[PDB]
Design a protein around this ligand. Structure first.
Ligand SMILES: Cc1ncc(Cn2c(C)c(CCOP(=O)(O)OP(=O)(O)O)sc2=O)c(N)n1
Ligand SMILES: Cc1ncc(Cn2c(C)c(CCOP(=O)(O)OP(=O)(O)O)sc2=O)c(N)n1
Ligand SMILES: Cc1ncc(Cn2c(C)c(CCOP(=O)(O)OP(=O)(O)O)sc2=O)c(N)n1
Ligand SMILES: [Ca+2]
Ligand SMILES: [Ca+2]
Ligand SMILES: [Ca+2]
Ligand SMILES: [Mg+2]
Lengths: 525, 525, 525
């Protein structure tokens, strides 16, 4: 068999059937004779390719396979890889290299130093030393991406390798099963359970890794048994809990002092599937107040090492959440009371307040909608106003890297054909990966894109307001016509200048058979 | 003085007055109190930021200063950095880092391992160990980017550094002058000159570094004195010679066997300011034929080391070209005859042949136009059909990385306000950095964008045709409306479906006061 | 031809005839059928291998070829590579890799990530993508090591590559000549010369790169014409000037404030072939005093970039020194007066004062002796007391990395069979590369090793005295018998407990036919 044939067999035997890519000449020998059981999803730029794959992987809870062109293609994607790293997204990034005979002279399209290019944003990066090694290296890539803590990996392949004879012994790779589904040993797990059972006022903090593991339901049970309030860890890339559950307390402020104040009086704080902590703004203070101790369960040694406080357990989030939910006692304490609904903000017949947009979305969207957020100045409001009862209902750039939500919303919609995806993206953010729209059009992936247009990089104007920073250039982005951009890429486009039109546009979008972009005129900050 | 004040003074004292950027919160403390003598050029995505800066640097023949946001912003730009590396573009890339107090915990927006991120595509990559070091590190960056062989460099700065007190001794940085304007010693230069003088049938091969040095005129003189044919080295990122000069022989084929055949019978081949060689397609054969010896002058040790044949001299291209042009004797040989004009291809009243487009451009454009090429299947024709008599008249992604020409054409037009820039870009390539259009609109930089629309990734269909590769997915890009995209970003848009309309559109574009995009319906391959 | 045969031919055609190594199984296929015209120099540990090669390269002023075993062998040498980096030593370090078929599984002896191992201490690091590429990669290594600024480079080769068929076109590599012998262009050189000619009180500062280039004699001439005092740049790895010349002012203190004070009143300071500056101790102050300006000539862009003050020219030191020495005018100023001889320190009939040892060496050694220094607390005295009139007469770990002088003295003696090498090494430093002695014994390389034994890490006790640091552990090294160590490795050993015995031992050593070690009982600090 050829390296080509063996590699495709390894992929399908490992459950991979889709290639997200933007092609080049180094990749032609790989893409030729494309398997009929495989599907190729083209995007027009590599940040879009990787973003779509990322959304697909996160929503599907399985690895996504990517094929990019050499150094330039890989480099175009490395902003996307920065989010993928922070979101533990299992992405297998392959890139084509020049033929071995021409790597030395550095012919055009040679990926020099290839493995070093994507670092430090990958778990594993490699170029095989011979054609026969390619399937083995692909096996390594598949497993490195998939093992806890999941993450992106990189494989560079000289284009002449594909047609070479494969090693007959490569068949041993095909059905390899590797498991990291592990939990704390019985003795120490009992100690933990006893500590939660004995807590007088426990609190729970959940991260994105909870949603990735589909441990949401177990976390509800654990919270119910412990009669404990549940917060989402700061800078949240996913939603790990029903936002309308009586225990839910919302998104934590991304500040050291703010979080210690919030947790004050809680004697034991159990953090599950989240970094400790993902702070953002500088909020000097105590990491924890006297009387509060912290216990973190994380799938990622790097997270456990860098936590500035608390004990930590490195294990699988699914296995740990299941175990805890089932072991802990049913506390006699009174179940926490549900947070009151958000107030309705005054709204005139003009520009729309972000709050109004989210209320309307909540009123009109299906109960199993999936939201993506890249409207950076309205995150707090979005979390307060959208009722997300099911898992996999929220996605936000884990590294704060813009250009995520637009493509990722397309990958999410591809992974969940029966759940309406609605991406809420600011006018600034929309541009980073605008060409992603074309993929939704071409494959008729019916994502709804809600563009929040206030003409400025609002979150930056705000941060600059706090720093009392004057004379900062480059904060306004006037003069963009998002309906024209959507038309340019074949996506149906609507405009909403007021509530009447917002309701009308949403009704039309929700009834449409393909992707739709709605440009919303929001108030200026 | 503050680190902020000292750094801006260092920049202006070193001739930098423009910041190409896309801002973030880590960068606010740097951008605040922006100097009135400085100018900020905003682009909507980092590949566009770096591409514009790249064109500006190459055309201006000086370093360009870039400011990006942390890891995600830097990563979005690394495809652009791959071209910059191959084109020796002096780019000073700065990125904002999290405050020092929060780097350890890996707060959101922390650039982890920052210096390793942009490698291997930079000459120098660094994050200073203290705020007071920032000006010194900026000095290092400026000089590393500017010294031969020029190239991109990377500096990461924690945002809390800017307001800190600068080291009083930093003033010694301000007026530092560093020179790499060097040439071969007298004795060995005389030996070289004697070898050229004694050559019976010399040939000259010029690379992009010739145009970068403005050594074009000296190369004409050298060619005239030696009565030698002049070729442009393969995969040419710039134009180093008048394409209508009697000595000019055009662009070399990017193949080993093709080049040795071309040079057969030439006893001495002098290569100046070019890699040896930038091959592309695999064309196995002799590097040089018996009787041909090669001498390379290059500014880049890496080029000299990796040449598979010939002698090499590592020195400044400007200094070497001047010295050779002035020292060599005036050969009694007959001056080479000028290549005959390209034939006129049959053109009906329908879709336009690439050849027709280039002939029309040549007929209508000013004699001092500057072209950019990202129409990958029509490169050979472009070189044959465009009369470029002056330096700085051609630019093409040095690393083959698409997404270059659109933004770079804007930077070129900014650097050369009196020379009409015309970017010829295929429908595929146009998408990679489409959002760059907005910058041309906002700053009224009057670049003309000619979009060659044949609905496919033509060069890939061709390479696949040679490999007889069947069933390759992802090669067609139908359904893009480039006039709508231009409208989306505020650029005047025209359409040319035939020659009559092409002539009309060009006439309008050439008379316009701002940027214009013309979508041209070209024939399908 | 085989890759083995082609590579050895490339080496000999490029002037390499010696392999410094410590062998392993990955290297057997390379070392087998060892060429009869080649010579193998074995050392017992890799720090010793590289140190011997380093001394050989520096003294011979040509590249030295090294062969080490995989990761462990390369890693044992990386302390040696840190000195080599700082001394611009042209070292070609090759290491054997596992067979390509077993690199994937990470068999024992696999060098994982090989090219990344030696960074950042090499100019170039590489593992070829195929056997046929090996000669081309070796060519790249040879030239990267040899081009200005010279430095160590690293090449990893899978052991199965050697027996494979070489590319017939590799013959083009054999006689490649690459030159970096360049100097400042005429116009700017004239400007420099005019500035030196106009200087009212110029001073000259020389670095190791001057001795490496053999530019010593030209620097004497330049100093004589300018009637200028000459200092050696701080932390000096070599001696660039006759220490008894009327212009010589000795070794500069390694402190910022000390150097600016020293240069005060000098209007133009010309630094040649040295970093600016290699400081050591923290001596806060002005980099230069008002009225002093600095001009640096360096072969190394990295040095020019990081100088905190002055103008810089990046060019070949040999070419620049020759040009300046020959162009500058003969100043009418009075030639500087020669520094007075060092005073004779009081010495009883007991332990020897370092000063006494150096005076005695100066009295007894041939005028063309070559010294090495790794007696860290007595450097200042050594420089004052040893008359070194010729080039290549002094070597000291450029990176301050101990374990250099012992092996390097053996390589120096190998390169200069007619010049008596005398290494002066403290009892602490002697241990780092003690096994190097065996190589001197086995090959009868007649280096003299003078061990300065005061029982302590003296320089550390001193630095700790300045920091008033109390309770520092690990500063004493009692209980080492250096005569027994020498006997262990087959080197004749003597002991000197007083001046009478020191004189006697030196007389015997100087008359000996092989290597000799003399243990000297020096006074405790
Ligand atoms: C790739 C990238 N570039 C730049 C930024 C910096 N940045 C920028 C540019 C922001 C403004 C986003 O503006 P928007 O219009 O999408 O939303 P708001 O107006 O609600 O802030 S938020 C922020 O962190 C980033 N995070 N990622
Ligand atoms: C960033 C990047 N991605 C992918 C490619 C691969 N690629 C692609 C996608 C090409 C087709 C460009 O199509 P076009 O429409 O711009 O021009 P033609 O139709 O004339 O080829 S040429 C080529 O090398 C690339 N070079 N750079
Ligand atoms: C490889 C290495 N390890 C440790 C040191 C630290 N070190 C040490 C250990 C010194 C003492 C050398 O002691 P010595 O006996 O050779 O000489 P003195 O007694 O004259 O200082 S000097 C110094 O920098 C070093 N420079 N290099
Ligand atoms: Ca906005
Ligand atoms: Ca096309
Ligand atoms: Ca000692
Ligand atoms: Mg990298």
């Amino acid at each position: 068999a050829s390296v080509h044939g063996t590699t495709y067999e390894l992929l399908r035997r490992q459950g991979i059937d889709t290639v997200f890519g933007n092609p080049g000449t180094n990749e032609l020998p790989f893409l030729k004779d494309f398997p009929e059981d495989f599907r190729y999803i083209l995007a027009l730029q590599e940040a879009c390719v990787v973003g779509i794959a990322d959304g697909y992987a996160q929503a599907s809870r399985k690895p996504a396979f990517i094929n990019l062109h050499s150094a330039a293609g890989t480099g175009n994607a490395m902003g996307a890889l920065s989010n993928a790293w922070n979101s533990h997204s299992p992405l297998i990034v392959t890139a084509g290299q020049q033929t071995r005979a021409m790597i030395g002279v550095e012919a055009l399209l040679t990926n020099v130093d290839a493995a070093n290019l994507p670092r430090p944003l990958v778990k594993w990066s490699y170029e095989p030393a011979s054609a026969a090694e390619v399937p083995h290296a692909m096996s390594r890539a598949i497993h490195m991406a998939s093992m806890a803590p999941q993450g992106p990996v990189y494989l560079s392949v000289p284009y002449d390798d594909w047609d070479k004879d494969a090693d007959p012994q490569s068949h041993h790779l095909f059905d390899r099963h590797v498991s990291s589904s592990v939990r704390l040993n019985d003795q120490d797990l009992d100690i933990l359970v006893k500590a939660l059972n004995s807590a007088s006022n426990p609190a729970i903090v959940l991260g994105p890794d909870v949603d990735a593991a589909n441990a949401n339901a177990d976390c509800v049970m654990l919270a119910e048994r412990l009669k404990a309030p549940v917060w989402v860890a700061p800078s949240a890339p996913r939603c790990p809990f029903p936002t309308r559950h009586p225990c839910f307390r919302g998104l934590m402020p991304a500040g050291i002092a703010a979080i210690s104040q919030l947790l004050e009086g809680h004697d034991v704080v159990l953090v599950i599937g989240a970094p400790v902590f993902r702070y953002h703004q500088y909020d000097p203070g105590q990491y924890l107040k006297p009387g509060t101790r912290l216990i973190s369960v994380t799938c990622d040694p790097l997270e456990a090492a860098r936590a500035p406080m608390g004990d930590a357990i490195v294990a699988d989030i699914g296995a740990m959440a299941s175990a805890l939910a089932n072991l802990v006692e049913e506390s006699s304490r009174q179940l926490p009371t549900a947070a009151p609904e958000p107030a309705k903000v005054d709204q005139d017949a003009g520009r729309l307040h972000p709050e109004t947009v989210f209320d309307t979305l909540n009123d009109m969207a299906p109960e199993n909608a999936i939201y993506l957020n890249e409207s950076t100045s309205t995150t707090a409001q979005m979390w307060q106003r959208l009722n997300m009862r099911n898992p996999g209902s929220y996605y936000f750039c884990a590294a704060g890297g813009l250009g995520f939500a637009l493509p990722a919303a397309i990958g999410v919609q591809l992974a969940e054909p029966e759940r309406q995806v609605i991406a809420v993206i600011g006018d600034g953010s929309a541009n980073y990966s605008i060409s992603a729209l074309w993929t939704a059009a071409q494959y008729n992936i019916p994502t709804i894109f809600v563009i929040m247009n206030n003409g400025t990089y609002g979150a930056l104007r705000w941060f600059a307001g706090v720093l009392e920073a004057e004379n900062v250039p480059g904060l306004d982005v006037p003069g963009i016509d998002f309906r024209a951009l959507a038309k340019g890429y074949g996506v149906q486009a609507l405009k909403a200048d007021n509530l009447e039109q917002l309701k009308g546009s949403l009704q039309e979008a929700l009834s449409a058979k393909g992707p739709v972009l709605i440009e919303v005129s929001t108030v200026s900050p």
